[PDB]
Paper text:
By administering enzyme drugs called L-asparaginases, which act to quickly deplete Asn in the blood, this drug specifically impacts ALL cells, starving them to death while leaving normal cells largely intact. WoA, like most bacterial Type II L-asparaginases, is a tetramer built by a dimer-of-dimer with 330 residues per protomer. In our structures we observe that the overall fold of each protomer follows the general two-domain fold of bacterial type II L-asparaginases. We sought to clarify this question and to further explain the substrate discrimination, if there is any, between the two forms, by solving the crystal structures of both variants in complex with either the product Asp or L-glutamic acid (Glu).
Since all of the four structures presented here were solved in the presence of ligand, we expected the enzyme to adopt the closed N-terminal loop conformation in all structures. Indeed, this is what we observed in the WoA-[name] + Asp structure. For WoA-[name], soaking the crystal briefly in Asp solution was sufficient in closing the loop. To our knowledge, the WoA-S121 + Asp, WoA-S121 + Glu and WoA-[name] + Glu structures reported in this study represent the first [name] structures caught in its fully inactive/open state in the presence of product ligands, while the WoA-[name] + Asp structure is the first closed/active state of WoA reported so far. An identical Asp binding mode was also observed between the WoA-[name] + Asp and WoA-S121 + Asp structures, despite the former having the closed, and the latter the open, N-terminal loop conformation. In this comparison, WoA-[name] + Asp represents the closed/active state of the enzyme (pink), whereas WoA-[name] + Glu represents the open/inactive state (green). As the catalytically-relevant state is the one where the N-terminal loop is closed, to better understand how WoA-[name] would accommodate Glu in its closed state, we modelled into the open WoA-[name] + Glu structure the closed loop conformation as observed in the WoA-[name] + Asp structure. This modelling reveals that whereas Asp fits without strain into the closed active site, binding of the larger ligand Glu (Glu has an extra methylene group relative to Asp) seems to be incompatible with loop closure due to several steric clashes. When residue 121 is a proline, it strengthens the closed-conformation of Tyr27 ( ), which in turn stabilizes Thr14. Hence, the extra interaction provided by Pro121 (but not by Ser121) suffices to promote loop closure, rationalizing our observation of the WoA-[name] + Asp structure being in the closed conformation.
Residue numbers in the entry:
A (entry chain B), B (entry chain A), C (entry chain B), D (entry chain A): 3 to 330
Write the structure that this text describes.
Amino acid sequence: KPQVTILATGGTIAGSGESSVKSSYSAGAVTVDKLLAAVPAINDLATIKGEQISSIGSQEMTGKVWLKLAKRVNELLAQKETEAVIITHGTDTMEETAFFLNLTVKSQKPVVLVGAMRPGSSMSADGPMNLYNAVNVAINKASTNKGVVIVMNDEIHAAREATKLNTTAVNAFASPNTGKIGTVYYGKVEYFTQSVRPHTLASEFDISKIEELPRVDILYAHPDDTDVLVNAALQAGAKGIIHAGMGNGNPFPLTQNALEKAAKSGVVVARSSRVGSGSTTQEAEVDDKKLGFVATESLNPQKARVLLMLALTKTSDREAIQKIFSTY
Amino acid sequence: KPQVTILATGGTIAGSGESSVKSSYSAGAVTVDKLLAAVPAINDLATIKGEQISSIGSQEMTGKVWLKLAKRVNELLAQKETEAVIITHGTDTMEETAFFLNLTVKSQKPVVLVGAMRPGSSMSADGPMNLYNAVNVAINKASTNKGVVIVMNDEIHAAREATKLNTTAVNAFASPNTGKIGTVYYGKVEYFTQSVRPHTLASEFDISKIEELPRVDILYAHPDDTDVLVNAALQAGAKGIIHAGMGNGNPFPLTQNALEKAAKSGVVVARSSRVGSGSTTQEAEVDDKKLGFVATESLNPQKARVLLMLALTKTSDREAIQKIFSTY
Amino acid sequence: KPQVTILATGGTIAGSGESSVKSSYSAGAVTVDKLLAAVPAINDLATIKGEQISSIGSQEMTGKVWLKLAKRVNELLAQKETEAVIITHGTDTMEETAFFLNLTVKSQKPVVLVGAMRPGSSMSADGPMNLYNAVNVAINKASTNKGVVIVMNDEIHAAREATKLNTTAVNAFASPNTGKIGTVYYGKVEYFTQSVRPHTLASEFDISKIEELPRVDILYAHPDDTDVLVNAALQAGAKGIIHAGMGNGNPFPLTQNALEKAAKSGVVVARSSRVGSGSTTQEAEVDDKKLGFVATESLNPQKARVLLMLALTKTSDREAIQKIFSTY
Amino acid sequence: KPQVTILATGGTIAGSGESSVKSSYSAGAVTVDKLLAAVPAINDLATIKGEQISSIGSQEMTGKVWLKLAKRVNELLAQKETEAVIITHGTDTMEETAFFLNLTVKSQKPVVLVGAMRPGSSMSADGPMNLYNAVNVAINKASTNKGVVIVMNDEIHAAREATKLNTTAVNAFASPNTGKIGTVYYGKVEYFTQSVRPHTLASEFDISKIEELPRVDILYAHPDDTDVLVNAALQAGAKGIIHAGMGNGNPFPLTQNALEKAAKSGVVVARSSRVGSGSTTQEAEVDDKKLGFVATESLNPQKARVLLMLALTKTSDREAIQKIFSTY
Ligand SMILES: N[C@@H](CC(=O)O)C(=O)O
Ligand SMILES: N[C@@H](CC(=O)O)C(=O)O
Ligand SMILES: N[C@@H](CC(=O)O)C(=O)O
Ligand SMILES: N[C@@H](CC(=O)O)C(=O)O
């Protein structure tokens, strides 16, 4: 039987509420051991080792825990005996952790993130099936070299493309610019596409000696916008700013002016969008070259932040960072 | 023939680029008169009066223009001769303008917002058809008392529900929590649903004597989040803050602490979500009553901002504002 | 406590498989009584009476069972003590039964259909939450006069608009031409829109004296299509044919010829589409008036069949049936 | 400049209506030469040769034309000078043609299918931009070995996954089980994923010596279904039947009995679904091995028909055909 390690971080999958029919609960309340005992059929599939990396709601995730988790995954997958890793994780920021790992894990062995939109104490809790299916994906031969994936609601999503697109639904995960790469239905795994953007072994990023990640803020654009948040981010030592712009990455004028100043001072300014999907494109209404900005293209603000944080471990050059957004 | 007024504000619909096959352009470059001449068939449908309210990209919209526009629409619709108003507008913040008008226009006569994702100079420009269809919706008997609507890509969307969900696509408008209320296909108008949330005549808000709207900022949540933007918004005189939270409206703990302080100081803190769709609910992981926050429920951050701005014209009470978010 | 009757028909909600982690199962295997005992919290909400109408997979539904079910619902809702009815039903044809009831139930009291995409024996079975939520929708004051609704996956869908759009997903139900009318999240019910198309009390149809429904066949269009299936449907006594056409209701020429003959012989031919969404429109590429056909507009083939079956209980006139498709 | 051949077959892209503001038109009314002259900017990109293969609405497509087209594409791509082929085609059955070519074209050079939902005579006609973008995709270096693609509405869809999902919308194309593999925005081409199912050079099918394809019918399932259409298809010499079943490929019992007889007589019976998306799976409610049926898995009925037609050129064995549906 293949050997897999499950790394637990917390989340609603390890969550608990007082009533099976009320929505109120606490995430990251249940230990890995207790979680794995709820789904005994996984032991028929693999030899499982569990480990507790953290016990938090993913809304409390930090770069420190990301670094810890990436180093540990890399350690585990370097072992001959370990065929894959599964990470149990809150859904709120699962897309950030997955995207981070997709660019920092140096292996072609599967890494699967899995969560739940309902706590295990809930009626019709989704976690048990999601976990069963994640183990099936982790051990499947076709899961090699697919990059880091999210397995939720019978779907396999590529880390670069995945996002949580709804606040409460069990089907909240989507890949709005592509779609899922595969399915897993009562454990039966099928892939239909793969990412052609570089990941994992092909990624230039390496965090093995990094203790702290660069600071990157995200700003939310709107009419009658301001300059005070740009200024506050600068004052707090931001090395990069993601601007979640109106439509195709458009800023309000006051804000644009403040961002132009930030970019002159050596803070990388990257244009994304608040809309939800599509590319924040070059050569539309904003002259990025003149203003000193990067266009994030087909990402979203929160994943663009992760990519910019990694870019900043190597460079702050505008062109070099544009190339990184145009590659990964 | 019915008489309709077209109020122009600018946008890509009145936009212009150097090449029909390149994506670069300037919004709000074409006058209303020139715009109406591109689509002569509208004169077969109605007697059209055009009026220039502004000439800007909608990313430059301000409350001052919203107020000017709302007062002018109310004036026009009070006239016996005027059957409807159409507003030509940039797509980037069309949803904010429409939502604002939906709560401030005191008439049951149709108000239709229309724009274009491609400028009129482009190959396969969408503006002409969108405008033709908007005039048909404006004059349709079933359009009465539907509230303010957006007409884009052969669809009719309710202002409360509509959002721009894609950066570039002609089909970027959606109503992710409901769906379109009707269709318009080569001028043929059909409605299938209507909003059951109060709007227009049934709205408690009145801006007739308002010259400036309260300041409301929006913050974008993520892992390793900060308190400095909350603090900067407070220091700039924010009367309300929309927090675009992780998943179902969840803040990072440092940020939560700063928001709790903001709310004690008398600044209304309203929880929305960065995810895109769904309700930011009460009684999930965040104890809104204990912390002093409002849950925005089934809105998004930019529309929640508009509602909170209107609410703040008369109250900063947490419970009264919750009731407003739970009603409109 | 409000009194509600649950009418069980079978389906995967009342289904059973040998293993909680295998996809294989039998629908309609579990009695109503056993089903209701799996979700004891419903008794806190209402006084429940259960009844067994049938015990089948919805793929075995027949017009006979529809008639039985509609007469029984009408009987129950005529009682002063009965506040609503819930029907437990297979998901495969739930949209047909719901649409049928939406046009034959003569009450404004709620009628809620509910099912499950996973049997109750499955890990992470959806039925229990779906049922809990359906009871909440049934007793909610705002559910009056909404027409017949489907409650699945925390969503409330209008019967006219709902369809099963995926083979296996718990979120398989959608309303592709509108969207859901409301939500129900751990029992909390909210409506955002309502249908403006006539239903229930406003429907002209009455099945109280009908023992058998007219025969209507559905044909699937494609390139290199044939005339032999039209001819076979005619020979078997079809009173109507739904043609699920290519794109916007387009037939292949051989088939068109056979359909033209059918329509001359007095068999109503109604044009729908195989695509999934949108209106099958008048005055596009097919000259319906010349050929003797009806355009089904914004329905799908299977719901168009139900509507045509009901239309045929009153008339076979082409114009009158066009008007019915243009109204309901 | 790269040399490309444009093969015209007809469709709404080569369509014409009497009015730019009315929906009525005739497809396949405009010659290739006239079509290419509407979009002169394509001559800046490539050296274009046009060729008229047919002049029809795609609803009139036949296997004879498919064969003619496939042989001609293979001929053209065998030429050293020809870098790609673009096929202008009606949208109604573009997905069938693309899928067929995806299994029969023995080259890695790009083949792009393109159409339009509005005729060139219409206001805001989509054809010009779609064609411009198709030429850019055809000449892009990353388009090699992606298989046959559909380019519509700024999107690039894999032939195996694409379908027309709406009757009238310019954005009617989708890939509901995956999503688009790339984008093309004012000619700028980007790929994000690729199919991992075998196509083109890797396909086992060869039609070079085929003059006529096997007959395969499609049936549309519903409640109170019949056996007469199965019987009529058998009597007309069907070699295969696609059954568009209820939910996850479920037949009505009378129909099932007739299909079981068809399969005993040596006619291949393949189970698909009427629902629109998802896999019609093995080992759910239907025992395919016992009954003698194939499960079509993640296709739809019209594409399953194409695959079964190709399969039938060499085998009618149930297990061999299952393996084909489970591979391609
Ligand atoms: N707040 C939770 C939500 C979930 O897991 O569904 C988390 O992200 O940890
Ligand atoms: N920036 C433009 C975008 C558009 O109209 O499509 C505007 O909103 O004015
Ligand atoms: N075949 C089942 C499927 C389900 O209920 O999910 C039925 O419709 O009865
Ligand atoms: N009936 C037309 C529809 C279109 O091209 O849009 C065709 O498929 O040829």
